[PDB]
Paper text:
Neutralizing antibodies target the SARS-CoV-2 spike (S) protein, a class I fusion protein which mediates virus-cell entry. The S1 subunit can be further divided into an N-terminal domain (NTD) that may engage attachment factors and the receptor binding domain (RBD) that binds the human ACE2 receptor. The RBD in the S protein homotrimer can adopt an open (up) or closed (down) conformation, with only the open RBD able to engage the ACE2 receptor.
To better understand how 10D12 interacts with the RBD, we performed cryo-electron microscopy (cryo-EM) analysis on the 6P-stabilized Wuhan-Hu-1 S-ECD in complex with the bivalent 10D12 HCAb. Density consistent with the 10D12 heavy chain variable region was observable on each open RBD. Because of the considerable flexibility of the open RBD, the epitope-paratope region was poorly resolved. The resulting 4.1 Å resolution locally refined map did not allow interpretation at the level of side chains but did facilitate fitting of a 10D12 AlphaFold model and RBD crystal structure into the EM density. In line with our mutagenesis experiments, K417 seems to be a key epitope residue.
Residue numbers in the entry:
A (entry chain A): 333 to 526
B (entry chain H): 1 to 120
The structure:
Amino acid sequence: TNLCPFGEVFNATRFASVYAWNRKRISNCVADYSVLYNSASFSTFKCYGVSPTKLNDLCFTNVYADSFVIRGDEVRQIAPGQTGKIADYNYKLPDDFTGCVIAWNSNNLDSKVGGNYNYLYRLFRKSNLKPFERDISTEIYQAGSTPCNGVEGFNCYFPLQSYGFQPTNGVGYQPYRVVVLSFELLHAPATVCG
Amino acid sequence: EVQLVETGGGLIQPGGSLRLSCAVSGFTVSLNYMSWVRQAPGKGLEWVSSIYSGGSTFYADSVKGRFTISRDNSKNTLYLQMNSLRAEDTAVYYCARGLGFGELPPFDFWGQGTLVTVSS
């Protein structure tokens, strides 16, 4: 009884870029995790911390929904203690990650003809991002000694680049809409289970 | 201008070790995208390893673990401490800077080349 709908995230119309990922704070409602487990419409389903089947008997305080789309070959880079391009420059996971990440192929609704320019991913940064960090920045990157702000050329690099997603792409170069659920535990009581 | 220094060729044996160096001008080794590539007779422009600007490193299949990547921030130069090699490492290794990505990252620069002589 008294369900709250979660279809505005998994069945959402449109996502955002990886460096502009959204967060959806969820509390004081009812989860239906067995349905999304038995959906069997996702190519990747790794649920860290707990067993994916018998997790339904335990519920936590808060769940934050994070949504982004990546290429089909960096799907292994979303993991605790894992390096890579987007792992170290777009989305960093904590080492003691107990969350739950879901990924599936999404070329047939987002990869139109000629590629889509609506998604941007960060290339250059001084160091690796901290775990659970967002960078909402359009700053041109400085890759040398001369200042790089309002100027282009050598070492004045734009850190954000688009994605080329043609319908004739191979299995390793397809847009995968990736959603991850972060589980929170604190002195506040658990709220979301049923 | 960007200059490149490839030195470290010499009489080497498999299982042993030596040291390799790459020197650059303009940008800095600890902040740009560098990638190691090699050329051998009977072999193409074979990618070796790469270092990321955030501190992470990545190698190929046959060179991971044995080799290590090294760099000095203030010296603006890069190092390859070749350790515990094999006989099949006879090649010419080139230092380069990867711009983007692909099968190999696009290198706007090529090293001057040093030929590894694994011979006893």
